[PDB]
Amino acid sequence: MAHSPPGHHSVTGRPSVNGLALAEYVIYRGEQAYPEYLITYQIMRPE
Amino acid sequence: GTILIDLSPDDKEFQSVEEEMQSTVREHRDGGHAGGIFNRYNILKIQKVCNKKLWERYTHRRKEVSEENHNHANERMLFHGSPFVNAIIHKGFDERHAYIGGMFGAGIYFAENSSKSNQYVYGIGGGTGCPVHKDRSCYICHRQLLFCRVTLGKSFLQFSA
Ligand SMILES: O=c1cc(-c2ccc3c(c2)OCO3)oc2ccccc12
Ligand SMILES: [Zn+2]
Incomplete structure (x- = not known):
């Protein structure tokens, strides 16, 4: 695993082309995330 | 040390997690190649993940970050999708769940879009x-995502395609 840019705790990938896309984020320490909910699902075939 | 607690579909907590999943x-741009073709999900179950030690590990680091960023952890709730979700809920996130060739370097990636x-x-x-049918767009096989509490702190802003 790499390090965050010096002076930062994470990276934010801000989409600047696909108008519909929301952000993606990267952390570089396992301890900066807690897996709160486990969601079980199926994707649905569109009509 | 992990226990999973099923939320009732009648619980408001179930309902707000479902809405965040469905609405995002x-x-x-791949037309469904990686993830399949769908506009929505059939939600089968939502479980709360409880593990004292992983929680205290998280809150200890969160305080550190917070104290380095004008008392602001900049905490979000974000989605994570992985073939390793069972290791993650039992033992926590670590470098083995990094995306070594990700566009922002080798770390652990999270999304605001559930579909991502x-x-x-x-x-x-x-x-x-899917393991059973070798179909990236399988409509039958059960999938699992995590909805996670993530401390971002001071986040480097990378504009990108
Ligand atoms: O949920 C995600 C999981 C992962 C992910 C990446 C590499 C992996 C992984 C998950 O498990 C196996 O190696 O990448 C993302 C990238 C952007 C937004 C969200 C994700
Ligand atoms: Zn399948």
């Missing part, structure tokens, strides 16, 4: 799809 689906995390449930690029 979008179309993807959905693309990694069977691996990078969706791998070879």
